[PDB]
Amino acid sequence: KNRAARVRVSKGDKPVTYEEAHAPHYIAHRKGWLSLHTGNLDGEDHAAERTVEDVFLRKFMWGTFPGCLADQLVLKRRGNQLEICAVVLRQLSPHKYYFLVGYSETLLSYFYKCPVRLHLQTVPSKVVYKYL
């Protein structure tokens, strides 16, 4: 049976998110896309280089904001700019958040030669869609 991106049923004590509660056949019906660029449009190029940046950015943020990411990243590209939008927990102190914003923005701007901006949206606790 199909397994991809599916959270198997449990007693009911497992909390899943909206994105985690929907399988691949809902990606364009009930879900959007976590990355939005033009590489995959008809007649566009550099789809393999925008993809490698996304795989690394999601890992850079997961290891740079450990335990603070409630949900997956939403990467946005507008021309030269790259916008990282994230939902984070409120456990960490704000002082440490501002440090990580200026460190990640600057480091990633010199690495991908592009203006990078990061927009945090803190949430008290991980939003729960339903309990599987």
């Binding site: 991809a4 991106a5 994105e19 691949p24 056949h25 990606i27 364009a28 879900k31 959007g32 896309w33 976590l34 990355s35 939005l36 660029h37 033009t38 590489g39 995959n40 449009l41 789809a47 393999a48 925008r50 993809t51 490698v52 996304d54 795989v55 999601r58 997956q72």
Partner: protein, 101 residues
């Protein structure tokens, strides 16, 4: 820090194919004609065959950039079917959705 030695060999192959690209092009041009004498074309057949084997572009293999898989690779994303689906099944590839018609 590449996936495996197989990937590392191709990296060298692709680096040596970029250095001799012009030299090989200029020598083949002589061979690929009916104008120049055979004597000169026979000397160019020995010059391009004496260059390192890794400069030949037919030895370059389009492997995956994450798992170095030689077959089942998509050229537009340079990914294997397994790595492509993983990112596509999680909605990480802009525009990629499952087809139903």
């Amino acid at each position: 820090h590449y996936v495996d030695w197989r990937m590392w060999r191709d990296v060298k192959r692709r680096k040596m194919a970029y250095e001799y690209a012009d030299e090989r092009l200029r020598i083949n041009s002589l061979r690929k004609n009916t104008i120049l004498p055979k004597i000169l074309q026979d000397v160019a057949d020995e010059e391009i065959a004496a260059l390192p084997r890794d400069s030949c572009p037919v030895r370059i293999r389009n492997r995956c950039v994450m798992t170095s898989r030689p077959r089942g690779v998509k050229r537009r994303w340079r990914l294997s079917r397994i790595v492509f689906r993983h990112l596509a099944d999680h909605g990480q590839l802009s525009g990629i959705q499952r087809a139903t018609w």
